[PDB]
Write a protein that binds this ligand. Structure first.
Ligand SMILES: CCCCC[C@H](CC(=O)NO)C(=O)N1[C@@H]2CC[C@@H](C2)[C@H]1C(=O)Nc1nccnc1OC
Ligand SMILES: [Zn+2]
Ligand SMILES: [Zn+2]
Length: 200
């Protein structure tokens, strides 16, 4: 679910950043490792903000709302990192939003790949499962990526842990594909991020 809008793509893949106060050194290191992880596999670059108008701010506060997708422009944009969402893979997911990725399960073509079990979604959280309107996303020829760092888990926003909200529609190499990994950027995430930033 890569943004269709070329203005939300960060110029030359250069994202200026600021790590805010109230983080431990250990937490600061995790942010750095996450940014490096994006730098390693793609042509995107994270640089300490000096006098730029556009930059990301790692901000110590409760998890959740909200992570701007792509370059907002004309000011800073925050990444909320709290006690329960400070791990490497979650930060990599958040930086996935920064570069310009929506959630994978909201791709305009997602109904061919996953079923959404509406009855199991927490009341009031159903909007998190709405498809992106087709004018907001361009997949760049890349297939639906079940392994994406941007893909929800099977029971994200579920009424209970043993109730699925998202069920993959078909088998992939013998079995229903696992979804919701927060370990590392997928082959698909990299391949698609390389396309979005025209990397060599
Ligand atoms: C339950 C509370 C709302 C959840 C908000 C998600 C959190 C997320 O996915 N973190 O990784 C978010 O921030 N989102 C959704 C996923 C990409 C988009 C939609 C992002 C968002 O809301 N972005 C913004 N949209 C409009 C204005 N400002 C935004 O971010 C600052
Ligand atoms: Zn997200
Ligand atoms: Zn993808």
């Amino acid at each position: 679910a890569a943004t269709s809008r070329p203005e939300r793509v960060w110029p030359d893949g250069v994202i200026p950043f600021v790590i805010g106060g109230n983080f431990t050194g250990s937490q600061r290191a995790v942010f750095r490792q996450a940014m490096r992880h994006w730098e390693k596999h793609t042509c995107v670059t994270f640089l300490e903000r000096t006098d730029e108008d556009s930059y990301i701010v790692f901000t110590y506060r409760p998890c959740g709302c909200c992570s701007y997708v792509g370059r907002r422009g004309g000011g800073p944009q925050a990444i909320s990192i709290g006690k329960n969402c400070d791990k490497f893979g979650i930060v990599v997911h958040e930086l996935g939003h920064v570069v310009g990725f929506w959630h994978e399960h909201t791709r305009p073509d997602r109904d061919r790949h996953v079923s959404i079990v509406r009855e199991n979604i927490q009341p009031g959280q159903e909007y998190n499962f709405l498809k992106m309107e087709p004018q907001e996303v361009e997949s760049l020829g890349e297939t639906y990526d079940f392994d994406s760092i941007m893909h929800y888990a099977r029971n994200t926003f579920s009424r209970g842990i043993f109730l699925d909200t998202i069920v993959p529609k078909y088998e992939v190499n013998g079995v229903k594909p696992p979804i919701g990994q927060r370990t590392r950027l997928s082959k698909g995430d990299i391949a698609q991020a390389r396309k979005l930033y025209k990397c060599p």
